[model samples]
Target: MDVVIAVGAPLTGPNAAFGAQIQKGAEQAAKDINAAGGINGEQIKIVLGDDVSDPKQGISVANKFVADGVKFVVGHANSGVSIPASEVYAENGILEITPAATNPVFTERGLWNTFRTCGRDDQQGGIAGKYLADHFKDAKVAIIHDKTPYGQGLADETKKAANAAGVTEVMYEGVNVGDKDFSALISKMKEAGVSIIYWGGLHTEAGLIIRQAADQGLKAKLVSGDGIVSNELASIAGDAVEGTLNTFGPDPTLRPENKELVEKFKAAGFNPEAYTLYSYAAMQAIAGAAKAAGSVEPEKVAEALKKGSFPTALGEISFDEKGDPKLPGYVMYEWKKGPDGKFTYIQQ
Candidate 1:
């Protein structure tokens, strides 16, 4: 049998649907690569292991992949999971690429085998903060996070940048995720006279915050990180999501050259959103590196990835020494209600 690409991610959790989309994108890339003659005439197979959004489970999955002798890994979408799992992969000399995890400490640890296909929280948060600082200079800003590594890190980066950029009266707070009530937080924000609210967390909490804020008649403008840029947020927040802004690393579907790939994904019943497209591009990067190295050796592939530039569905993709995508392509999007009662993107 050919070597299998082990997919490590939260395949069955609050983010399970997005995980499935990413898995589908990766699987499609594998199928296409095999049909076009895979590396060394060996077909590529994808073996999925659910990390369940838990760091311990992610480490267990990495150990399992190592035991299975799978050197190529794609996943563990959350930064918290990716961090510990990466240590295990590094110990085993397994080359792992994360499609969505954006924490910078992942690469700062000097792990040779750890790579990421997405921009770090600093990049995304800085972009958003700069834009807000320039546009809403006099507005009172209230920043909140879920108190998790990913959420707090991004929120702190944004808050720091926004403060540096001259935003005034900025209040930073931490909240517990999965909290059913945020009335107290809303009241506090209202009391603080916040004009803009930045939420650094995923859709589950963001949706609840927006709905609860709306219920309490707190009309502060809302913004968030890439974590809440999902159709599920639209479903939960409904019209409340309208006029809300969020930042995402990149959206492959926006590239004209990605038309064919978008069609392929649509034919397979997948939404070609930022998450799916970037995940697919990660697969393409791996395949390109494998081909360029002409070997599946982890070290060789890692070196190839460092030197190789690949044409991805999301335009051209290249990596820096830190394994971050070299392209300068983060975008902010506003949620607007479409005529069909769906939330659509208003690019900013």
Candidate 2:
């Protein structure tokens, strides 16, 4: 018999690259677990769902997993998708651990089945907000968000922290997702003498904004949260990505103990970049909890998850009362050219 686990994410959307990371990480973790006598002596079988970063699609995927007998899930990257889909998972008795969804509301709703391998938006936003207050207090700052739950939520959190620290942004605005032209926004920013742009959205829009701002001759440094940590941002922003800054979890792939796993991912032609190892850790959590509880049941696994400490690619992790991982918080990173002469985010 096999324990079916589903990896639900945006497999075919603007955020598909992140979805791929989750899928690949879960796949590798399943392989490793199955090879090691499986979880509680049952082989691990992975299923997948493509949420496309849509809340409606996320619900559909959740229901499909329920019908498919999947009792465990490891995805839905966007907080907007993750939050709604979580209700479906909760009603159906499925346990879900997200690798990237960082909105504080996801865990704050008191759901027993909800868990995350990543830090919350409040924690990440605080770092970005304090950084802006400490480093760019004398410079003109502009805050921008993409208007989704995760985007606006993080932006507002950052705003709260920055304002509390007496570093108010000169301009604050929200942009629609999938918006390409930031010309008008850039014009307004330039008029306001914005020198530091704090973005509360994913890399897609951030990349476009950075490129457009530079093309329009706006000399502003773009700072953001983990949403823009993808290497794909460089491909979109070109040379403008040079000094762009963002906050993210400490690089887990750089850990000395994970050298072989990192090489394995590289040899397989996949760069286990942002959130890959986090997804792997999500699976490890499931397996470890099932082992501790001595059962494959969702309720048993959920309780074990809250109490058990699991060793993972991200190091030892335990869940708090709200299902948030008790791990290190966010850190700063700067985009720069890597040894391969290609631009990527490097820890600063």
Candidate 3:
């Protein structure tokens, strides 16, 4: 018998890099488990669904996963898609574990079957905003969002935290996704004397703003979330990517426990960066719960997951009653130029 687990994400469109990470992680997990005697002698089988970064497509792919008899899922990496797709899984008794979705609603809506391996944006954003307020005290800050639920929600949380910390934002604005020109916004930031800009959006726009800000000589530093982790950021922003601040879950590759696991991924020709190890950890949580329950039943696995912490590539993962992981808080990262024009985030 084969235990089927569906990996869902946007395999097309702008976020395909995210989908590739999840695919690599899921494949590696199945190989590891099968070699260790499989889940009670049943090989793990993966089913792939391409949500293509759209909520409507998210629903369509989720329904297909159910129809194909997959009892477990790890996916719909985008929060907007995950929120809706989770309903289909929960209503049909399938267990889900998301690697990158950070919206609080993924776990806050009383769904026993929905879980995530990442920290909530509220948790991360609050840390980011408070950090900015503390470190950049008296600098005029601007809060901007991309008008998506995930982006706007994070921006709102950051704004609240900054305000609570006695940091008054000079500008709060929303930009449409895929809109290119930010000249008008840049002019406004300059007029407001903003020294730091907190962008609640994906890497595409964030990188552009960072690049364009320099192109037009806007002096504010860019602070953003994990959505800006893509390698594309360095390419798009080039030298402008330098000094950009980001908040992400504690570096999984930096942990001693994951050394062998990280090596295995590299040996297999995978980068194991960003959300790669996160999805690997997602599979760990799923299998650990399955072992604890001694069955493949979704209800039993969920119960097992709720009762205890499980070991994974990301270290010990315990869940609250709400199904949010008791993961470590976010850490700060800075983009710096490296040799030969390379760019990446180094922990500060």
Candidate 4:
């Protein structure tokens, strides 16, 4: 039997380029596994399902995976798109492991089939809120989001934490994802006398907000979550993104254990940053769990997942009772241009 795994993600939308990294990483995991003489003599096969990062489309893709009889699924980068699709997987007995999608509701719903490689919004937001309170104690802060499930969920969590920790915010706002002009928002920001803003959205909006704020002389620095770590932020915000701060897991590519894997990606001209290794780890976990169970049946594999620690490009990791990774909290990062002039983020 050809063991099939599905890579679910938004492959053709605003997040397409980022989504491609997940797909590419998953493919590499499969390639390495199959090249090592296959999984117990059964070759691996991959199915591609692009949800376009939209909720409705994600649900459709989820149903299609069930119809296609795919037992294992690797990703859906955005939380807004991952949650609904997760429901379809749960009701039908499929095992889902997301490489990104940090929303807490994703794994908190008590679904037996759902798992994730990344930390959740609650964890990410709590730290972010406390960091803001500590770093910008006297500055007036602004909390903003794109209003999608992922962005809004992260923003709300940060707001709750910030308020609990004694941080007073000057403004809270929501913006559309593809809005190019942030002049109106900049005016409002200036009127509010904002000095520091925490943008609970992706790089597209975060980059634009910071650039326009500079144009209007607002001087409010933008701090954001993992979604803002995309390289596009540098391109979109230009020199204005220099001071932007983001929170994510420590760089796995820098780990001594990942040296060989990193070399492979570099040889292929892929950066393997962000969700790439995490995606590869998701697939690697599936293969490890399947081997542990001695079968491709997801029922047994899911059991193996919860009960065992799996080694991967991210080192050894295991899941908690809620199917979330038992990992440390996030670390802060700074965005900057290197000697190569490529837009990149550095750990803070």
Candidate 5:
């Protein structure tokens, strides 16, 4: 018998890059698991679900997984998509472990099957907020979000922490997800003397804002969370992406233990950046828990996951009662040109 695990994400859309990362990691992980004798001796099967970052479409993907007899899932990268789809998975007895959804509600809802390999927005936001207060406290700061659950939730958390630290934002604003022109927003920020811009959104909009802000000579540094960690940000922002600050977990690819894994990915022409290893680790956690429970059943695996720390490409990870990963704290990163003459987020 084979246990089916669906890797769901926006496989075709503006966010398709992230979906590619998820697919690559989860697929590679399944190959590794099967070659090592599989999960409890049953070979693992991976299927893809392209939700396209739409909440409604995410539900459709969830229903399809249920109909296909998939007992495990590793995605729906956006928090907005993940939360709604998780209900469907729970009702269908399928366990889900998101590699990138960071909103606290995904785990806070007391669901029996929801988990994540990524840190919560609150955790990452706290780090960003405190950083702002420490480094740019006296500078004119602006907080902007895309108005989605992940984006706005992260902005609010950062705002709360920064306010607690006695730093006040000169401007707090929201933007539409598919927005292209940010001239008006840049004009407002320029008028407001906003020097430090905190962007609570994904790479698509964040890159545009960064590039447009620079084109209009805003002379402001953009700060953001994991949403903007993709290398594509530099492709959109151009040279303006330099010096942009971001918050994310430490680079898993930099870990010595992941050397072989990283090489394997690169050999396959994949970079494995951002949430790639996290997705791989999601599969690892599931496989480990299945082994620990001595069963491939979702309920038994879920219990084992909540009570155990499993070895993974991202190191040993354990899930808390809330289904959030009990991992290291978030850290700061800065966009810089690397040895390859490419701009990427470098740990600060």
Candidate 6:
């Protein structure tokens, strides 16, 4: 029988582009595996399901994957969706490798089946907070979230870490995603005289906030999490994004060992973004474990994953006890306008 891997993600929602990128990466990896003799001569197939970035949808999709007898599952981008969906997988002994969900509690709940390729908010938040504290010492800061589990949770954690690092005069607020106007929020930040604003939300809200802030003459520096690390943010925020700061994991395109694989992605017409590289790594890791275990069984593969290390396009692949990658925390980036008048990121 072919080894089937099910992918559950927000392939048709507000964050659809992000999910699509991950799927593309996984599909490419499957092709690569098949070209390399397909894990003891059994073909690998990827079955995709769209959870619409909704937690309820995630649960339903996960149950469907279990019913289909797929032992390896791949997605559900947001932590909110991953948390609930992971329970369904855990109960059925399915291994879920998430490329984007970052909340720490996802692994802490004892669901041995759940694993994350990305670092948790604790790691990202602490790094970002310390960076800001050291650089923008004594600057008035404001933190905001979209009230979702991923956004609010990261924001709260970052705020706590920032406070502990002696960053005073911090304000926290919430905003609704997909809301048209952010004029009032910009006005509030201006009123508070915020010098730097830390926004814990996806690209949709982050882009709008930057555009609105520019319109309101609030020239405060904007900072955000990995959710906003995409080219779409540059399109939405335009020149306004030039000076904005954000955090993201290692840029896979820069990895020297992945040069040929990166070219393959480009030839196949994929954008090779942060999550895409992580998804590719997830597929490679699972395939390696399956080969080592000599079976596609979830428990056996999970055990293999715990002890197996493989070379990945994103770098070396290995997992800690809690199933999080033993990778570096998020790196700070500043957006700069290229000679073509397009915005691109520079390591800060």
Candidate 4, 1-348: lDDT as tens digits: 888789999898878767877998899999999998666667789999999888899898998899888988898999888888988898888999998999988888989888988899988899888888878778898898998889988898888888888997989989888888888888888898888888888877787788888988898888899897567678788998887888898778788998998898989988888888889989888888888878888888888889898888888888888889886679888877766787577887
Runs of candidate 6 with Cα error greater than 4 angstroms are 338-341
Off by over 4 Å in 2: none
lDDT of 2 by residue, 1-348 (tens): 899999999899898889989998999999999999999999999999999988898899999999999999999899999999999999889999999999999999989899999999889889988988888888899999999989999999999999988898899999999889999999999999999999999989999999999999999999988887677899899999999999999788889989999999999999999999999999999999999999999989999999889889999999998899999989999999989898988988
Please give the distance, in angstroms, between residue 259's alpha carbon in candidate 3 and its true position after superposition: 2.4
User: Candidate 4 vs candidate 5: which has greater TM-score?
Assistant: 5
* TM-score of model 3 vs. true structure: 0.97
State residue 274's C-alpha deviation in candidate 5, in Å.
Answer: 0.9
The CA root-mean-square deviation of candidate 3, after full C-alpha superposition on the true structure, stands at 1.4
User: 133, model 6: CA deviation in Å?
Assistant: 0.5
The alpha-carbon deviation from the true structure for residue 54 of candidate 6, after best TM-score superposition, in angstroms, is: 1.2
lDDT per residue (tens digit) for residues 1-348 in model 6: 888898888898778888877898788888998899886688888899899888888888887898887878888788999999888888888899998899888999977898878888888888788877888878989999999878988888888788888886458899887786988888888999998989888988898888889888997988888888778888888788988887788888778887888888889887687788888888888888888888888888888888888767777778877788887678898889755467877677
Q: For all the candidates, what are their Cα RMSDs to the real structure?
A: 1.5, 0.7, 1.4, 1.4, 0.7, 1.4
- TM-score, candidate 2, is 0.99
lDDT of 5: 0.93
- Residue range with the least summed lDDT across 10 consecutive positions in model 2: 226-235
User: Between candidates 1 and 4, which one is better according to lDDT?
Assistant: 4
Candidate 2's C-alpha lDDT?
0.92
Candidate 5 residue-wise lDDT, 1-348, digit = tens:
899999999899889889988999999999999999999999998888999999988999999999999999999899999999999999889999999999999999989999999999889889999999999889999999999989999999999999999899999999999989999999999999999999999999999999999889899999999998788899899999999999999789999999999999999999999999999999999999998999989988999998988999888999888788888889999999988899999998
Steric overlap count per candidate: 1, 0, 0, 0, 0, 0
**Model 5: runs farther than 4 Å from truth?**
none
Residue-level lDDT of model 3, residues 57-146, one tens digit each, is 999999999999999998878999999999999999899999999988888888879988999988988998899888998999999999
- Candidate 4 yields a Cα-based lDDT of 0.86
Report every candidate's CA lDDT.
0.83, 0.92, 0.89, 0.86, 0.93, 0.84
**Candidate 1 lDDT over residue span 177-257, tens digit each:** 768788999999988888789998888888888888888988888888889767888788778878888888666676788
TM-score of 5: 0.99
